[PDB]
Amino acid sequence: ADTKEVLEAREAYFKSLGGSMKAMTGVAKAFDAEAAKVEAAKLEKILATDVAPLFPAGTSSTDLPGQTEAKAAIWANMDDFGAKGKAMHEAGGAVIAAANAGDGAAFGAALQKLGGTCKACHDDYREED
Ligand code: HEM
């Protein structure tokens, strides 16, 4: 697809994740198993997205100044970038299971683990200022 659509797709994917992280953070603060499962259901849908095809070479912030925050570095570290995405999917599965187990403590713990995967990747691959 055109750069405009992959950029569109990956932007929507990440916005959805951000909204999910935000909502689950609030649930973790005041655990309600029903709201957790609702959030987990949404996170599950989000994680079904194949994002590898969302980062084709030529879509870094240097190629498309201001259109994206993806750093050119991603393309010099695709194995690490994929690994970090993988870590997120795994952390996500744990958050989903904890929500479904109705386990508030595990949910909060898994959520910390998930947040960490977002940071681990952003630190090396997303544009700050
Ligand atoms: C962890 C679950 C996670 C969250 C939360 C998250 C959020 C997020 C947002 C809100 C954006 C900005 C979206 C927008 O344009 O409004 C964003 C952008 C990027 N992310 Fe991220 N992200 C999470 C996880 C990860 C992981 C696991 C990776 C790397 C393996 C990653 C990468 C990126 C990149 C690159 C961007 C820039 C996208 C762009 O501007 O085109 N994120 N993320």
Side-chain angles (χ1 to χ4, degrees):
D2 185 46
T3 59
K4 182 184 288 184
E5 185 49 76
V6 307
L7 262 59
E8 253 177 35
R10 85 190 185 205
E11 240 88 350
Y13 172 70
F14 290 121
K15 274 184 168 63
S16 297
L17 270 184
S20 180
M21 255 316 285
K22 179 177 184 63
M24 297 190 285
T25 294
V27 179
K29 288 177 183 182
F31 199 74
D32 179 272
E34 295 302 311
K37 291 168 186 61
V38 319
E39 295 302 336
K42 167 174 168 185
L43 178 63
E44 183 158 74
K45 287 285 179 211
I46 295 174
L47 293 176
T49 298
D50 183 28
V51 306
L54 299 190
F55 288 91
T59 45
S60 82
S61 57
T62 40
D63 296 307
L64 314 184
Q67 247 101 270
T68 174
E69 299 179 311
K71 291 174 71 84
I74 289 165
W75 292 272
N77 294 275
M78 277 299 334
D79 287 310
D80 182 61
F81 184 76
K84 286 182 180 187
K86 179 191 165 300
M88 182 193 65
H89 281 95
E90 207 172 84
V95 170
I96 289 160
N100 288 317
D103 192 340
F107 178 75
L111 189 68
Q112 297 287 347
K113 192 63 61 181
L114 177 57
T117 64
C118 316
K119 187 171 192 298
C121 184
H122 290 166
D123 283 354
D124 290 341
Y125 306 117
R126 180 189 172 188
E127 278 309 339
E128 65 311 292
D129 56 75

